């Protein structure tokens, strides 16, 4: 699994790596050495770069998509050295050496910063990014790029991005480049249908105030008066209208969850046989099929081992399906 389609082997050559796991209680060979681990290149620099090892520099991060892209991020705690200029050598002399030692993998020394914003900006360099957003509750980073440097923005498999999503550990978001790509105003006035029936008496009170969310209504329903002061007129009718809107939101969220858990849409075209019940077909179609046109192509692999079925019942159901689909040829 740590090998590559281009990293190649035959008895006789010397391949190096880092001993990553040792299982002396195993049955046979128990000296497990890997190569795709990031810190590997770190130690490579340790045996090549004189700046590392003496604490004068600090190799912090390493994003390694093996065979695709191997970037390194370092930081200098001293005030008389540079992070990238000293480690590159003399116009790609030692970095290219460690690259051709690793297998000619493209190695670009990136400079991480104390904040994830500049970190992911440099990780996708040299290229422009029109929007950088961080999200903690989603554990993600929205990186919206501009047109003009796409040849360096994505590349193959989005490698210039694939490293960042692999380095920070957060599944980034680089999807859309059209209007409202900033993700800061992409939800301010793009989905206006939030207060469907809230101000039922009139409409001319003041400008809308989105800075609360209008959708949570769990951190907003029952709060002290100092948090609901952003909108004036917090009387009993107003709080009751808010509670009614929160109840409607709860009902809608419950319906959405009930619909999303069952990603099958079980209609009445599913219980025409003898012996088929709700959970049977639920599981059978949650295994990856949709309707009757995609079930006769299987056998005891999928239809067996279901809650409430026996191997003989599975054989019976599969022969009935094959006779109604393969042996009947009707539509």
Partner 1 sequence: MNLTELKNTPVSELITLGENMGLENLARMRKQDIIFAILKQHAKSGEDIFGDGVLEILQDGFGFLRSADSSYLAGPDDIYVSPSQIRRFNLRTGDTISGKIRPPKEGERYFALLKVNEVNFDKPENARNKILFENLTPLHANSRLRMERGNGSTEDLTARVLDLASPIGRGQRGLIVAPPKAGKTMLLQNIAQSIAYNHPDCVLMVLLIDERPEEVTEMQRLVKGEVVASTFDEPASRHVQVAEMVIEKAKRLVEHKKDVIILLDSITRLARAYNTVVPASGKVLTGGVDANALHRPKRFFGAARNVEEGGSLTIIATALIDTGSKMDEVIYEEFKGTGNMELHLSRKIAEKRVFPAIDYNRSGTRKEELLTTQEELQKMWILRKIIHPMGEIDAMEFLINKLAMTKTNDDFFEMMK
When asked if residue 126 is in the footprint of partner 1 (CB under 8 A), the reply is no
Figure out which of the listed residues 2, 3, 100, 278 binds partner 1, where binding follows CB under 8 A: 100
Minimum CB distance to partner 1 smaller for 156 or for 184: 156
115 binds partner 1 (CB under 8 A): no
Q: Which stretch binds partner 1 (CB under 8 A): 9-17, 34-42, 156-164, 236-244?
A: 9-17
Q: Does 27 bind partner 1 (CB under 8 A)?
A: no
Contact 141, 172 (CB under 8 A): yes
Please tell me the total number of residues recorded for the chain in this structure: 331
- Looking at the Cβ atoms of 100 and 257, the one nearer to partner 1 is 100
In whole angstroms, the minimum distance from the beta carbon of 8 to partner 1 comes to 4
Q: What are the backbone angles phi and psi of residue 31, rounded to the nearest 5°? A: -120, 85
Region from 1-9, 184-192, 237-245, 269-277 binding partner 1, contact rule CB under 8 A: 1-9
Please state the closest distance from residue 72 (CB atom) to partner 1, in A. 20
Name the packing angle between helices 116-123 and 159-167 (round to 10°): 150
Indicate the burial class of 174 (C-beta count within 10 angstroms; 0-12, 13-18, 19 or more): buried
Contact flag: residue 6 with partner 1 (CB under 8 A): yes
C-alpha distance from residue 47 to each of 42, 53, 191 (Å) = 9, 9, 56
Q: Is 50 in the site for partner 1 (CB under 8 A)?
A: no
Task: Provide the H-helix boundaries in 156-272.
Answer: 159-167, 236-261
Q: How do strand 140-145 and strand 129-135 relate by DSSP bridges? A: antiparallel
Q: Examine residue 55 and tell whether it contacts partner 1 (CB under 8 A).
A: yes
The reply on whether position 80 binds partner 1 by CB under 8 A is no
Interface positions, 263-302, toward partner 1 (CB under 8 A): none
Looking at residue 146, the DSSP 8-state letter turns out to be: P
Q: Least distance (Å) from partner 1 to the CB of residue 7? A: 8
Please pick, from the candidates 17, 50, 92, 104, the single residue that binds partner 1 as defined by CB under 8 A. 104
The half-sphere exposure of 238 on its side-chain side, counting CA atoms within 13 A, is: 8
- Number of residues engaging partner 1 in binding (CB under 8 A): 14
Cβ neighbours around 93 below 10 Å, total: 9
**What SS3 state is found at 81?**
coil
What does the binding site for partner 1 look like in residue numbers (CB under 8 A)?
Answer: 6, 8-14, 24-25, 53, 55, 100, 104
């Amino acid at each position: 699994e740590d090998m590559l389609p281009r990293e190649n082997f035959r008895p006789g050559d010397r391949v190096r790596g880092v001993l990553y796991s040792v299982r002396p209680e195993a049955r046979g060979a128990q000296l497990f050495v890997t190569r795709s681990k990031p810190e590997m290149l770190i130690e490579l620099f340790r045996i090549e770069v004189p700046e590392i090892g003496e604490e004068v520099i600090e190799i912090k991060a390493a994003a390694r998509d093996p065979g695709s892209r191997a970037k390194i991020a370092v930081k200098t705690n001293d005030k008389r050295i540079d992070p990238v200029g000293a480690c590159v050598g003399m116009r790609g002399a030692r970095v290219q050496a460690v690259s051709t030692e690793l297998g000619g993998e493209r190695i670009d020394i990136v400079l991480w910063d104390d904040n994830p914003a500049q970190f992911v900006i440099n990780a996708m360099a040299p290229a422009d990014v029109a929007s950088i957003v961080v999200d903690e509750d989603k554990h993600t980073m929205d990186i919206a790029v501009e047109a003009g440097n796409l040849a360096q923005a994505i590349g193959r498999n989005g490698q210039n991005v694939r490293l960042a999503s692999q380095l920070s550990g957060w599944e980034l978001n680089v999807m859309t480049v059209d209007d409202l790509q900033a993700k800061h105003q992409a939800e301010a006035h793009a989905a206006i249908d939030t207060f469907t029936k809230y101000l039922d008496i009139d409409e001319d009170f003041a400008t809308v105030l989105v800075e609360e969310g209008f959708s949570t209504l769990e951190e907003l329903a029952y709060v002290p008066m100092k948090e609901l002061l952003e909108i004036e007129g917090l009387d009993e009718p107003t709080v009751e209208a808010l509670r009614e809107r929160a109840k409607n939101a709860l009902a809608t969220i419950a319906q959405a969850q009930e619909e999303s858990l069952g990603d099958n849409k079980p209609a009445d075209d599913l219980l025409n046989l003898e012996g088929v019940d709700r959970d049977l077909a639920f599981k059978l179609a949650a295994r990856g099929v949709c309707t009757l046109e995609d079930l006769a192509e299987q056998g005891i692999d999928d239809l067996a081992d279901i809650e409430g079925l026996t191997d003989e019942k599975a054989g019976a159901l599969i022969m009935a399906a094959r006779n109604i689909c393969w042996f009947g040829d009707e539509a």
